[PDB]
Amino acid sequence: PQITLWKRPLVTIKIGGQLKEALLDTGADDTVLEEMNLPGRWKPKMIGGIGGFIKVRQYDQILIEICGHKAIGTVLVGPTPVNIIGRNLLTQIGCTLNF
Amino acid sequence: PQITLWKRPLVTIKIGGQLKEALLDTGADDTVLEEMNLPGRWKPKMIGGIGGFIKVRQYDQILIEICGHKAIGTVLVGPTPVNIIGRNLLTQIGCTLNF
Ligand SMILES: CC(C)[C@H](NC(=O)[C@H](C)NC(=O)OCc1ccccc1)C(=O)N[C@@H](Cc1ccccc1)[C@@H](O)[C@H](O)[C@H](Cc1ccccc1)NC(=O)[C@@H](NC(=O)[C@H](C)NC(=O)OCc1ccccc1)C(C)C
Numbered sequence: 184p185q186i187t188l189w190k191r192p193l194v195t196i197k198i199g200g201q202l203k204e205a206l207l208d209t210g211a212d213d214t215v216l217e218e219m220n221l222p223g224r225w226k227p228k229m230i231g232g233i234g235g236f237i238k239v240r241q242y243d244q245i246l247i248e249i250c251g252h253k254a255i256g257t258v259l260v261g262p263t264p265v266n267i268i269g270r271n272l273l274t275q276i277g278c279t280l281n282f
Numbered sequence: 283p284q285i286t287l288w289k290r291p292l293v294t295i296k297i298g299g300q301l302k303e304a305l306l307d308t309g310a311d312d313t314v315l316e317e318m319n320l321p322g323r324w325k326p327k328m329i330g331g332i333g334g335f336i337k338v339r340q341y342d343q344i345l346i347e348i349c350g351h352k353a354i355g356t357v358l359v360g361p362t363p364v365n366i367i368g369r370n371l372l373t374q375i376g377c378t379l380n381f
């Protein structure tokens with residue numbers, strides 16, 4: 184699709200077999216989602232943003248669908264106020280900025 | 283341009299005869315710079331991110347060029363480690379996300 188930016192670019196995602204919604208975020212290096220269980224072993228990570236740092240669990244090689252488009256990569260899970268799809272997954276679906 | 287997301291989408295901006303660089307940020311409602319010398323007065327404003335909330339300095343009607351595209355809008359000055367072009371200005375240059 185082509186998504187204009189008059190409102191937040193929230194889209195449907197599927198992860199862990201569950202439909203969620205998440206922000207397509209070109210200002211995020213990483214993907215950070217709300218609390219959920221994911222397969223495999225996680226490792227602790229800190230991520231920083233506006234306001235400071237938070238503690239997350241890093242899961243590698245996770246399947247996610249973003250508007251039906253499949254990506255595999257690292258998903259961070261933790262107490263974020265919004266589900267964020269970062270560049271690590273945006274690149275996998277061939278997402279670009281255009282003007 | 284059509285900008286891929288393998289690295290941060292930093293672009294040249296011009297504000298008050300100063301060239302800077304800033305991140306094209308679809309996850310930012312607002313535009314936030316670390317500094318400028320924006321014409322005098324400002325209004326306080328709160329913004330939030332992943333780590334919590336921060337007070338910033340709001341300036342209205344600021345003229346900015348983003349990759350040579352002229353825009354006018356609100357610019358916040360706040361504790362961001364990276365200059366951020368948010369959706370309030372991305373819309374003005376016709377920027378979209380595409381996949
Ligand atoms: C999501 C993270 C993985 C992401 N960070 C990174 O990519 C990394 C790895 N961080 C990194 O490099 O950190 C280095 C660092 C950290 C701390 C100190 C010094 C240096 C990030 O926070 N990125 C932000 C910018 C940034 C980039 C690099 C370093 C630091 C900050 C966004 O682009 C990102 O899009 C977030 C996503 C987000 C949205 C909503 C909630 C939480 C997070 N938006 C924002 O932080 C913006 N906020 C907002 O747009 C919101 C939601 N609105 C808002 O506040 O509106 C007004 C309002 C709200 C509430 C009440 C009243 C008014 C902000 C830049 C303006």
Ligand SMILES: O=C(O)c1ccc2cc[nH]c2c1
Pocket residue numbers: 226227228229238239240
């Ligand atoms: O999920 C956790 O138990 C946890 C605890 C501490 C840290 C530090 C970074 N990530 C963490 C996750």
